[PDB]
Amino acid sequence: SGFRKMAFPSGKVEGCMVQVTCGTTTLNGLWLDDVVYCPRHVICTSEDMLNPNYEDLLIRKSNHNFLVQAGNVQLRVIGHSMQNCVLKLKVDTANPKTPKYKFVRIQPGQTFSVLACYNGSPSGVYQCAMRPNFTIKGSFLNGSCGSVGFNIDYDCVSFCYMHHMELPTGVHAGTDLEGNFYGPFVDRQTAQAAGTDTTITVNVLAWLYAAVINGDRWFLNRFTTTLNDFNLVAMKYNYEPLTQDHVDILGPLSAQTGIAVLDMCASLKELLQNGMNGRTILGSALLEDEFTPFDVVRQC
């Protein structure tokens, strides 16, 4: 029993984490086989930050302009190339600690673990979700760029996020490991702003199912709802629309608890209307939206 925001064990990623220096800029890189992946903005200078021409900046660089340090070891850069917003540094050693891995681009609402890193060394691990506005609500200081987000299915690491930058509201933006940004963002210091964020409805429902599985029913009610009436109410509270896909996805949890998905939706409508009235659900006084249906089944 119990229900906690759990991250994946970080060790398979820790063994991949290196330091990449270009000029006066140092940040983290991800070393898999003989390639080190890092944000291309490591080659930016102070005057380049608003409208850098990365192709022009990159063509001016030689392999020895990139220092890559793995623990106490310098790796030799023998090649370089850019893919979208990530730089790929060929090195002369395959990482002996390379796990089984893949690169996966995720959809808003998906969760993943973040290994926060500074100077190529891991600081801490925590759990995040891709917000509907394609930002994440991270914990990142200066020097954290190149830190990555991942899940681990069986023994295979699915890398899904690389950290690039912090927006003015203090949330974070970044790319998949093919260097494509999540959301409309660009690796330039020109004014950018996250869109208004919304609550991940399918995840809240998942987490309500988790509370039932761990023995709490106080918030249920005798009502149901049509899917359309639920969405009409929920969007007035800035919740994301719930789709038939999401309903389908909640099937297993509905069967395990015996509570129909649209019955749970009616419980959620009431909670939005009433609040908690001094009660809590799984230790929280707010509705939690950073647990997916998949997370709930794996943890419970």
State both tokens at 32: 């898999």
Scanning 150-158, 181-189, 198-206, 238-246 for contacts with ligand Y0S by CB under 6 A, the matching segment is 181-189
Note whether 20 and 68 are within 8 A (CB).
Answer: yes
Whether 16 is a known active-site residue: answer no
Residue found under tokens 């509270």: 237
Select from 44, 87, 116, 204 the one that contacts its own copies (CB under 8 A): 116
Select from 16, 30, 36, 44 the one that contacts ligand Y0S (CB under 6 A): 44
Long-range CB contacts (within 8 A, 24+) of 54-59: 54/82, 55/82, 58/82, 58/87
- Binding string to Na ion for residues 31 to 60, with x set by CB under 5 A, is what? ------------------------------
Provide, rounded to whole angstroms, the least separation between the CB of residue 165 and ligand Y0S: 4
Note whether 28 and 117 are within 8 A (CB).
Answer: yes
**Among 16, 41, 80, 160, which one carries the catalytic annotation?**
41
Select from 70, 75, 136, 165 the one that contacts ligand Y0S (CB under 6 A): 165
- Binding string to its own copies for residues 281 to 300, with x set by CB under 8 A, is what? --xxxx------------xx
**Among 145, 163, 164, 246, which one carries the catalytic annotation?**
145
Note whether 40 and 53 are within 8 A (CB).
Answer: no
The edge-to-edge listing of strands for the beta sheet with 77-83 is 73-75, 66-70, 17-22, 25-32, 35-39, 86-91, 77-83
Q: Please count the residues of the chain.
A: 300
Note whether 120 and 19 are within 8 A (CB).
Answer: yes
Tell me which of Na ion, its own copies, Cl ion, none is bound by residue 106, counting a contact when its beta carbon lies within the kind-specific cut-off of 5 to 8 angstroms: Cl ion
- Binding string to Cl ion for residues 97 to 126, with x set by CB under 5 A, is what? ---------xx--x----------------
In the complex with Na ion, the residue whose CB is nearer, 54 or 118, is 118
Q: How far apart are CA 131 and CA 134, in angstroms?
A: 5
Select from 29, 109, 120, 174 the one that contacts Na ion (CB under 5 A): 120
Backbone phi, then psi, for 294, in 5-degree steps? -65, -45
Per CB under 6 A, 288 contacts ligand Y0S:
no
Provide, rounded to whole angstroms, the least separation between the CB of residue 53 and its own copies: 29
Backbone phi, then psi, for 232, in 5-degree steps? -65, -35
The SS3 assignment for 59 reads helix
- Binding string to its own copies for residues 168 to 197, with x set by CB under 8 A, is what? --xxx-------------------------
Tell me which of ligand Y0S, Na ion, its own copies, none is bound by residue 109, counting a contact when its beta carbon lies within the kind-specific cut-off of 5 to 8 angstroms: none
